Design a protein around this ligand. Structure first.
Ligand SMILES: [K+]
Ligand SMILES: [K+]
Ligand SMILES: [Mg+2]
Ligand SMILES: [Mg+2]
Ligand SMILES: [Mg+2]
Ligand SMILES: [Mg+2]
Ligand SMILES: [Mg+2]
Ligand SMILES: [Mg+2]
Ligand SMILES: [Mg+2]
Ligand SMILES: [Mg+2]
Ligand SMILES: [Mg+2]
Ligand SMILES: [Mg+2]
Lengths: 740, 740
């Protein structure tokens, strides 16, 4: 029948939790504000503050530029959405039989065409705010982390983690709240037509991820162009420290961290959150929950997320208060414990939520038939995703942390030069896919078996139920990155850089981990969305052994490579420019190498601004146009193949790129830190071994920061896009087969 | 209906063409014998023949070693083939109703369990002979190519190309003759049970690809460990010319070209040919050709191959007689003319064959139903694969020859160091997959529609119809590669090496093209076998949106990466050892760097001998065990997913790795040749640009020569293997689902 938790209870619980998540984030921002500094040893607090201003000014500046374009694109694309969805019923205004129940009347397809546009814009905008907010907190916390490092690793860790949590909590609560608001607003018009309500609502994730795609690639190109240029000429050529203020590309590099690893990453994960929620909602909308108009159960995913916010708050308190770091070897397990604790607490949280928000029996729509599902089967659906996530974290840590043998061997291979470094690095990344894929496959199998597409979507959301914490441990990294950047630029003592280098190395692992969650959840949500698309397209069977499906499958499997070709080439080209620029300034500015002359930072900022803004367009277009072109020309069966193929194929390359990139970075950190006999025998900085690592790191740069992480967006974006345009491809698509 | 050409004529025609092909091969060998030399400036000729002997001894010594292990394994696996297939009908000896026509009676399954073992071993042995005969001609032709280079490139080119033709006509004609024999031999037992006959014949391809997986991987690891070692210490560290007899790894390296790029590749393409024929045969055996016992049409594939030889013979004359070569500008065009001419003639050829060897109307088995097909549609099926082959060749040249921009930009990117070289090279390879996939997709759509799994399989044969030429142009490369290594080692003039370097460069592009054909044809044949596998396993539908298929799909898609992880790491490790070794000799043996002392070659041969024999086992096991493990534990649905997944995923990485690898190679050559202002700008040899390219080149070594090309075996092997064991899996597999 109904659940223990009455509807009005749900309607209160959700926004209350969002409000708690927001209040908690503000509180943390407030605590961080205790670290004082101003640009008006005293000299060192003044240099930190000016550098921080430079970075802040650059990051805010680029985003406004980027968002202007993306914002325009968004508005264009929303028009396409209205037009195409609107034409499905020739823009009629009349009601129609509910496609999920012929006996009832549903709102016109036109309404949905309109509201899908509204949720799209909503998601687009929210995705922009997610990246902008993360950027504001990161550019605020970076120099404060630097100053706090004067007292030790532990203190700096706290200010970087707290701030990472500012972003995590803000993003989760705001994404939750907006969606919650959107649903309640849409419902006023839809009333009893919940299928229409929730089918319109899915624009929200389409919005989120479209904007994310450009945010990730734009930011991604911007940052790696600087990073490669700065590192190659500075470290490999001119034998100076990494973020040396003599290096004209350092400002661009550090801004790059906020603009890619933060803003782009933030948008990326918002889209993950939005899509997973949306995919669970559409399926439930025509399951027993939606048909019987049972609000609490319908909003199950949002209740899961609300509780995630609370669990993550708790988990946060452990790292922030109940515990203290005194030694560097403690940083990574601190971070790892955030995942362990949250996963355990959330397992209990989901149990409770599954107990009180689900009737013990219900039906889940399953390709035209109401499948009987029990609430303990559902618990296992979200729990299996949540646990697959954790497994993925552990495996990814094992492959990217310099505490373990894979990366150490990679560093060790530097002893025979760059070529062996790269071979080992590539080999490592390839190897690293094995277990996450099994974890994903297991997740699919359990969740698919128990509750079809709905179960799979709820597994995705389970993997993202602790998104607040996931984001915190991840956002922690770029802030720690800037901290050391600012330390070197501020001429602070070697003790500070060693501390930031410890934080930053842990950040590399944490980043690989976040990528892992992004890929894992993306594979889940995409499968669910694929299934939903299939019903909506009135496809009876996706048969791999039909010519239309199979050509789609193989072409779909190529797109991730097409996409990587473009993004790699962009970074490669922009970095080539950057290096020529950096060399020139060392070669022609008297006193630069000497330390008496100040370099031109703006020119480097300009090179990575010009390249990113321009070169984000073709890959964005590839992804976004593909479902349209394929659906219109070849049709829904073929598009089917493309969805499956880009899923199973993209996922392998996404994982191996992000991990290979991470492994190289930390293999270099291992050499730079020389905190063991092995490490030292590879040093010191400047050695042939070290420069070999730098070469690896630098090749890994676009792998793990531009193409790699955007691949998960490629996959999940094409999937909501397809679901949103499904009736339009069903009705007006497959032209090439119609004319012939 | 039946065909113009009588069964008796077909029985005569086939071996005549085979005999002709062998007659033409021996002839070319005799001409090569004209270039006389011996061991036991004429001081050169003695040194060359001394050098040639170290290599010939090395190649031979390794293959025997390698073939000892493979042969043993070949025996073990054959037992499994007998046990597992025997267990289908409890090892009964009674006849049984035909699988395809219940009204009729068919031979015992046990009989087939036996013949499948017979054809398998027949295949393994014919594979080993293919690689061995290729090594023998190559090891005989290399020094002959060196000596005739004293009279310009043109004369050195013919001895090289004639020798390439020797391997190509022996392989194409021997695989044909044995198959033909095996069929007729098998017929004696099977009589009217053609279904049983040609299902028994499929073991042939399973055998060929089985004894090729190990030869490609094993030989690919021997070479490349040597290659990376010799080049990194030689050129990058000690600044001596490539293949300098000072370098203790040069003998292994030049042996490696024969043991990997000749032997391994020879076996690879044998598998490709055997599988394509066998695949075409099995669908035909239960089509109207096999039901109505129409022999000529039944052996249509073997008839296509037969005219293939003749056509390729004619085509070869154009390079051997009808047209000569002066400018190095001409070599690449001469090689590419061989593709174009053979493709045109053979288009007419297949038209002839299709007009005389097929009834104008017939039926093709189509997933349980006889599908009406017209002989002109079959013409199109093989032609589309034939032309797809040419397209793939052209595109592969565009992305791998240093006469075009992609590779030139890659070389150019060396100006900013090894990292930009690697980033650019990686991007290029990714890029390069687009058009070939499209070609493959088009071939599939056209062939699948017309004639189902038969068309597709016949499209694979179409792409391989000119294999005699394909092998000629490809084998030519390693022969040229050795010819330059011997020149250096014999200390002939700069002008000698500069000529072979041009021949070698042509060989690089030519080896990439061979890789395209291998990958292109493998995608085609695997899909047909997959199809065949599906009927044979009594699967109604391969539905992507089922838990069993989907987990198969994503896991299958991971396999190519797991396999690449092993093979890359293998070369990485062996390469690390080889460098440590070449350095050891350079630092200890007094006056070695001078030339007053002889390096210990045997040590370097041992490091690579030890690595390859050991390290080829796991990846072989992975590919061999996967169907068995998946089919038995999870069942034929999941294995369906695995097969589809490993196909669409593995092809992307196979192409991109091969092209990247070829690209870095030719970019290095480009600099080394300095035949333009731009090339000379990056030089001279020893320069930073040249070293950065060497780094890129040695990273690409395992990419194009170990992992990359082996992947096409991974895909096609798993497909035949799955087909052969289908009844077993259908009957006794799926355990994990039965018990729970
Ligand atoms: K990081
Ligand atoms: K070659
Ligand atoms: Mg850097
Ligand atoms: Mg950074
Ligand atoms: Mg940094
Ligand atoms: Mg890092
Ligand atoms: Mg970096
Ligand atoms: Mg080499
Ligand atoms: Mg070689
Ligand atoms: Mg060579
Ligand atoms: Mg080569
Ligand atoms: Mg090589």
């Amino acid at each position: 029948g109904a659940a223990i938790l009455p509807d009005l209870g749900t309607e209160i619980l959700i926004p209350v939790c969002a409000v708690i998540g927001i209040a908690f984030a503000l509180f943390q921002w407030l605590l961080v504000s205790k670290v004082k500094l101003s640009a008006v040893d005293h000299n060192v607090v003044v240099k930190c503050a000016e550098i921080q201003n430079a970075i802040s000014e650059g990051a805010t500046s680029f985003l406004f530029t980027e968002y202007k374009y993306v914002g325009i694109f968004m508005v264009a694309f929303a028009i396409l959405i209205f037009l195409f969805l609107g034409s499905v019923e020739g823009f009629s205004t009349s009601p129609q039989a509910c496609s999920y129940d012929k006996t009832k009347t549903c709102k016109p397809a036109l309404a949905t065409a309109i509201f899908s546009t509204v949720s799209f814009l909503l998601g687009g905008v929210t995705s922009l705010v997610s990246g902008f907010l993360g950027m504001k907190i990161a550019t605020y916390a970076n120099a404060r982390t630097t100053l706090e490092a004067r007292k030790g690793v532990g203190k700096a860790f706290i200010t970087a983690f707290r701030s990472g949590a500012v972003m995590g909590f803000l993003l989760a609560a705001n994404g939750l709240l907006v969606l919650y608001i959107a649903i309640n607003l849409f419902k006023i018009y839809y009333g009893d037509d919940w299928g229409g309500l929730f089918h319109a609502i899915t624009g929200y994730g389409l919005g989120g991820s479209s904007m994310a795609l450009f945010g990730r690639v734009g930011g991604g190109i911007y940052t790696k162009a600087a990073d490669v240029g700065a590192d190659l000429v500075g470290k490999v050529e001119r034998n100076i420290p990494e973020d040396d203020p003599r290096n004209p590309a350092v400002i661009a590099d550090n801004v790059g961290d906020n603009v890619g690893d933060i803003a782009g990453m933030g948008s990326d994960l918002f889209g993950s959150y939005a899509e997973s929620s949306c995919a669970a909602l559409v399926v439930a909308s025509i399951s027993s929950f939606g048909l019987n108009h049972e609000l609490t159960a319908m909003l199950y995913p949002l209740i899961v997320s609300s509780v995630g916010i609370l669990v993550c708050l708790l988990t946060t308190l452990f790292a922030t208060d109940f515990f203290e770091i005194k030694a560097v070897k403690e940083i990574e397990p601190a971070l790892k414990k955030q995942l362990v604790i949250s996963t355990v607490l959330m397992t209990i949280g989901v149990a409770v939520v599954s107990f009180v928000a689900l009737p013990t029996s219900f039906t889940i729509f399953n390709f035209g038939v109401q499948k009987d599902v029990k609430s303990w089967q559902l618990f296992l659906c979200v729990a299996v995703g949540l646990w697959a996530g954790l497994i993925i974290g552990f495996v990814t840590e094992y492959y990217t942390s310099n505490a373990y043998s894979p990366v150490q061997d990679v560093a060790d291979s530097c002893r025979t030069g760059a070529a062996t470094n790269v071979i080992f690095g590539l080999a490592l990344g390839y190897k690293s896919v094995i277990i996450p894929i099994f974890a994903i496959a297991i997740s699919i199998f359990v969740s698919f078996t128990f509750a079809a597409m709905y179960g799979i979507a709820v597994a995705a959301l389970g993997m993202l139920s602790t998104i607040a914490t996931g984001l915190a441990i991840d956002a922690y990294g770029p802030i720690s990155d800037n901290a050391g950047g600012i330390a070197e630029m501020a001429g602070m003592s070697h003790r500070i850089r060693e501390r930031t280098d410890a934080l930053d190395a842990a950040g590399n692992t944490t980043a690989a981990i976040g990528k892992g969650f992004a890929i894992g959840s993306a594979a889940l949500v995409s499968l669910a969305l694929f299934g939903a698309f299939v019903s909506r397209a009135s496809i009876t069977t996706v048969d791999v052994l039909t010519p239309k499906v199979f050509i789609g499958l193989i072409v779909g499997a190529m797109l991730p490579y097409w996409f990587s070709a473009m993004t790699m080439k962009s970074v490669g080209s922009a970095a080539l420019k950057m290096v020529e620029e950096v060399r020139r300034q060392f070669n022609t500015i008297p006193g630069l190498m000497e330390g008496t002359a100040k370099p031109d930072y703006a020119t480097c900022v300009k090179i990575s601004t010009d390249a990113s803004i321009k070169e984000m367009i073709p890959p964005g277009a590839l992804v976004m146009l593909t479902p349209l072109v394929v659906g219109i020309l070849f049709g829904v069966e073929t598009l089917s193949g493309v969805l499956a193929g880009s899923l199973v194929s993209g996922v392998q390359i996404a994982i191996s790129a992000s991990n290979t990139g991470g492994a190289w970075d930390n293999a270099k950190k291992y050499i730079e830190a020389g905190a063991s006999e092995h490490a030292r025998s590879l040093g010191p900085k400047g050695s042939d071994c070290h420069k070999a690592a730098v070469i690896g790191d630098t090749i890994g740069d676009p792998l793990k920061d531009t193409s790699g992480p955007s691949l998960n967006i490629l996959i999940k974006l094409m999937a909501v896009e397809s679901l949103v345009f499904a009736p339009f491809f069903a009705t007006h698509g497959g032209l090439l087969f119609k004319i012939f």
